[PDB]
Write a protein that binds this ligand. Structure first.
Ligand SMILES: *C(=O)[C@@H]([C@@H]1N=C(C(=O)O)[C@@H](S[C@@H]2CN[C@H](C(=O)Nc3cccc(C(=O)O)c3)C2)[C@@H]1C)[C@@H](C)O
Length: 262
């Protein structure tokens, strides 16, 4: 809608950035799409796809979520608050999934990628749910360089929204697993300043944040409104200079703007 577009372009233009938006309203099937077929560096938002891949594996492997991983010091990375907390005792795969979603723990992500059988297992999972755009090229934290015109570690807003729709709200997973994935998202701790900040206080938000160089500022969410069906919102944003500061307020403004239309 022209009203959305103008608001989005001014926001985007005013912040000297490139913004990508896909919103799917699962109530009526209406979508709002802005640069939605263009690639953007996903940064930590990939962890959503990773947790889903693990849930997919657990469908054939019923001990998987409860498998205890005794990781070591050398697995610990600069950003690993939960895996650090639990070093002495280790963590289950389930706990690793919750920590990578809700605290964006990088050790937890790398441990789960290894559990799945490597980077290509995550991509093949994305292919298996019909996501042709998602590409994971590097482990954490290298995947967050977000360099101009570098297609490594990118997806499109449309593809990520479609995948979040199918996994959380659709039939890509079995019921126990899709329910678990929604519970993890709803317990996210990193998302207050982004899509959550832009949605009514009486709504429930389940989201995965990501950020990185070039002031990249990303958030992907399912929104549970006070009336009607759930809504999927993906927002990717990146800026001119390598050391740009993230613009979390831009994401909240996008959300405000989009939710006005529905
Ligand atoms: C993925 O986006 C990111 C994971 N997940 C995050 C998140 O969702 O909150 C981040 S970034 C967040 C905003 N700025 C800081 C940050 O950049 N911390 C940071 C980054 C790199 C290394 C280290 C470290 O060496 O300790 C810390 C928190 C969280 C790091 C990517 C970039 O890993």
């Amino acid at each position: 809608p022209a009203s959305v577009d103008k608001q989005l372009a001014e926001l985007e233009r005013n912040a000297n950035g490139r913004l990508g938006v896909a919103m799917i309203n699962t109530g009526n099937g209406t979508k709002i799409l802005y640069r939605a077929a263009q690639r953007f560096p996903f940064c930590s938002t990939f962890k959503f796809m990773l947790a889903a891949a693990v849930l997919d594996q657990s469908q054939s492997q019923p001990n998987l979520l409860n498998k205890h991983i005794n990781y070591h010091e050398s697995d610990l990375l600069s950003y690993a608050p939960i895996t650090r907390k639990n070093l002495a005792h280790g963590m289950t795969v389930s706990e690793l999934c919750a920590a990578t979603i809700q605290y964006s723990d990088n050790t937890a992500a790398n441990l789960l990628i290894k559990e799945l059988g490597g980077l290509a297992a995550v991509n093949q999972f994305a292919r298996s749910i019909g996501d042709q755009m998602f590409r994971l090229d590097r482990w954490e934290p290298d995947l967050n360089t977000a360099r101009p015109n570098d297609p490594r570690d990118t997806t499109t807003p449309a593809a990520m929204a479609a995948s979040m729709n199918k996994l959380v709200l659709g039939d890509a997973l079995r019921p126990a697993q899709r329910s678990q994935l929604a519970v993890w998202l709803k317990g996210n701790t990193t998302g207050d300043a982004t899509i959550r900040a832009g949605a009514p206080t009486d709504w429930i938000v389940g989201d995965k944040t990501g950020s990185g160089d070039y002031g990249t500022t990303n958030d992907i969410a399912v929104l549970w409104p006070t009336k009607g069906a759930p809504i999927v919102l993906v927002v990717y944003f990146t800026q001119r200079e390598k050391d740009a500061k993230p613009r979390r307020d831009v994401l909240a403004s996008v959300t405000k703007i989009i939710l006005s239309q529905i």
